[PDB]
Amino acid sequence: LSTTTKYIFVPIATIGCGKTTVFNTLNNLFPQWTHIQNDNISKKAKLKICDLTLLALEDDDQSVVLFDRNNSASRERRQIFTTIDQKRDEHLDDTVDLKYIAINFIPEDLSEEELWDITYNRVIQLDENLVESVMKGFIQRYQPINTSRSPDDQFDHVIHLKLSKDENSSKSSLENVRIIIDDLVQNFPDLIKEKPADELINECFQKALDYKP
Numbered sequence: 315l316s317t318t319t320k321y322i323f324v325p326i327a328t329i330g331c332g333k334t335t336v337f338n339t340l341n342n343l344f345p346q347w348t349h350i351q352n353d354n355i356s357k358k359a360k361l362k363i364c365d366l367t368l369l370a371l372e373d374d375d376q377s378v379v380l381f382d383r384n385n386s387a388s389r390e391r392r393q394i395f396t397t398i399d400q401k402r403d404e405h406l407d408d409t410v411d412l413k414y415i416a417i418n419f420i421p422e423d424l425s426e427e428e429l430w431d432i433t434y435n436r437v438i439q440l441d442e443n444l445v446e447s448v449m450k451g452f453i454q455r456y457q458p459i460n461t462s463r464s465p466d467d468q469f470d471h472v473i474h475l476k477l478s479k480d481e482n483s484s485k486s487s488l489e490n491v492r493i494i495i496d497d498l499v500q501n502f503p504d505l506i507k508e509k510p511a512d513e514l515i516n517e518c519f520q521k522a523l524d525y526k527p
């Protein structure tokens with residue numbers, strides 16, 4: 315109406331950290347949010363994920379883009395800011411406030427050994443040697459978020475997730491969905507007025523967990 319705010323949720327993650335499960339759960343709770351999955355976009359597609367993001371932020375309808383890519387490498391976050399900042403004036407008028415929220419899927423204190431152990435067994439449980447090999451490449455390129463310097467200092471806010479083996483029958487992606495919701499209620503009350511009920515979060519996560527694409 316007068317000064318609408320849009321949000322782009324940028325994961326920093328490697329394969330199998332739970333990005334799509336968490337974003338699917340969120341989309342299941344908030345059907346108006348736009349979940350754009352890089353895995354669904356051809357490498358020779360006319361519109362790539364950055365183009366599809368801006369297109370999915372034009373209407374007064376569309377406030378949230380779930381940007382579903384690993385962005386394990388620093389340059390992959392730089393691309394997002396530069397490309398979107400650079401094409402924003404093509405589509406959005408000067409009343410649109412755009413915020414980038416990092417969703418950090420890999421704790422600061424996690425070792426590569428435990429990162430590998432958790433994500434690899436998630437994904438195995440499709441030549442086996444080449445799925446392993448692609449996962450390794452995203453880990454080799456992984457540069458932890460560093461909001462003290464370019465480009466990560468352009469984030470408006472960071473949400474720190476956990477990456478654990480499941481304990482006490484609590485999947486860490488479900489723990490992570492709750493963190494994101496609690497964080498948004500606190501720090502962006504206009505995005506989520508009041509929480510979904512706990513059982514609706516559980517059911518929406520159950521839907522995401524048992525998704526067989």
Ligand SMILES: Nc1nc2c(ncn2[C@@H]2O[C@H](COP(=O)(O)OP(=O)(O)O)[C@@H](O)[C@H]2O)c(=O)[nH]1
Pocket residue numbers: 327328329330331332333334335336436437439480485486487488522523524
């Ligand atoms: N054990 C466990 N598995 C999970 C969790 N979250 C997601 N998964 C599963 O791990 C696999 C990959 O997760 P996905 O969300 O696709 O990871 P992405 O590659 O980051 O999208 C899927 O089979 C999920 O069902 C979790 O918290 N615990």
Ligand SMILES: [Mg+2]
Pocket residue numbers: 333334335353
């Ligand atoms: Mg995925």
